[PDB]
Amino acid sequence: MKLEPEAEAEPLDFVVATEREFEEVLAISGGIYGGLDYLPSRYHSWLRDPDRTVVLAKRNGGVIALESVNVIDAGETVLVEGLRVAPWERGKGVAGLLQRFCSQLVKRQHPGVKVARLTRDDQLGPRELKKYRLITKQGILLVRFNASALLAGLGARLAALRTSGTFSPLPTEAVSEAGGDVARLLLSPSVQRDVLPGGTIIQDWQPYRPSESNLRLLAAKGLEWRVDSRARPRVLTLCTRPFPIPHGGDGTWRYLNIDAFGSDGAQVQSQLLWHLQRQAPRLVGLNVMCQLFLEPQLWSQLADFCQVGLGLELVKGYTEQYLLEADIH
Ligand SMILES: CCSCCNC(=O)CCNC(=O)[C@H](O)C(C)(C)COP(=O)(O)OP(=O)(O)OC[C@H]1O[C@@H](n2cnc3c(N)ncnc32)[C@H](O)[C@@H]1OP(=O)(O)O
Ligand SMILES: N[C@@H](Cc1c[nH]c[nH+]1)C(=O)O
Ligand SMILES: [Cl-]
Secondary structure, three states: OOOOOOOOOOOOEEEEOOHHHHHHHHHOOOOHHHHOOOHHHHHHHHOOOOOEEEEEEEEOOEEEEEEEEEEEOOOOEEEEEEEEEOHHHOOOOHHHHHHHHHHHHHHHHOOOOOEEEEEEOOOOOHHHHHHOEEEEEEEEEEEEEEHHHHHHHHHHHHHHHHHOOOOOOOOOEEEOOOOOHHHHHHOOHHHHHHOOHHHOEEEOOEEEOOOHHHHHHHHOOOOEEEEOOOOOOOEEEEEEEEEEOOOOOOOOEEEEEEEEEEOOHHHHHHHHHHHHHHHHHHHOOOEEEEEEEEOHHHHHHHHHHHHHHOOOEEOOOOEEEEEEEEEOO
């Protein structure tokens, strides 16, 4: 005998999101990522993206879940982002149903897509190891500071570090995306093999294969880049413009994401400093969650630099960002 389908008194309805559901989406998003949720600041942007479909699950006419799918890598990849289920609806399989609906939508709307990708920091287990390939991983360093405090004290801390011989920042080199420097870096086969994690660009949790088509997407975001040497690149860093996050409930917090590629810890330190000096003046009067993604064996060095050297507070211990990939059949 076959298993008969279970009747549902309150079946889920899956619909494409519009601006009118923003407040309902906020209402299901309390506490996400400990206050580092980007969706409040990004939801309206998402609605404009040409290769993105933002799907809502509704029950009894009310939004209870959300997932975004976005086609990238010149049509070969769908990136899954933002997956969330209202707290009062969790533990019932809702996320599983929403993911299945979105997979069906991708198969119908984007028949050329070959794989799905996503990033996560949750501990991976045997199940994850069978559904996904691990493309790469980075360590995650999360620190917090008041920008006015950093602005007032940073110069004097650097002076003390320099005069004691403990730390002076090494020279770094300018990278102009408009001038073609980013393309020259990211399209280099040697950069791809030796600098980028698993040959991939990760920008504020979003993975991109290094290709002309993806560089266009990166170039519209207003990123800031730095490198140790354009001629012989070994450490490349990427700062995403800071954006408001709900942490703290008061509107005073911003999220500053820096992705660091390569293995020279001293250059990661110098480039981190460079980005903080670039970004802090516009953050005056605000509080900052700064999250640095870097090769795992550099985490302790950079955590010490941030805390003891720069006077920033460590928010949590070591965690990892996993880039996961599954085939679409
Ligand atoms: C791309 C974005 S990354 C970020 C993820 N987003 C967040 O951080 C936002 C906050 N978070 C949430 O919004 C919810 O917490 C989420 C995670 C969305 C879950 O939403 P939810 O609706 O509660 O999820 P459920 O479908 O019930 O989760 C079942 C899945 O956990 C495993 N699992 C373990 N124990 C189980 C059990 N007893 N029964 C069934 N599955 C079980 C299983 O592996 C399955 O997955 P699968 O095998 O794919 O079915
Ligand atoms: N896959 C997650 C990645 C993430 C961003 N911030 C924290 N985690 C998402 O799209 O929401
Ligand atoms: Cl030094």
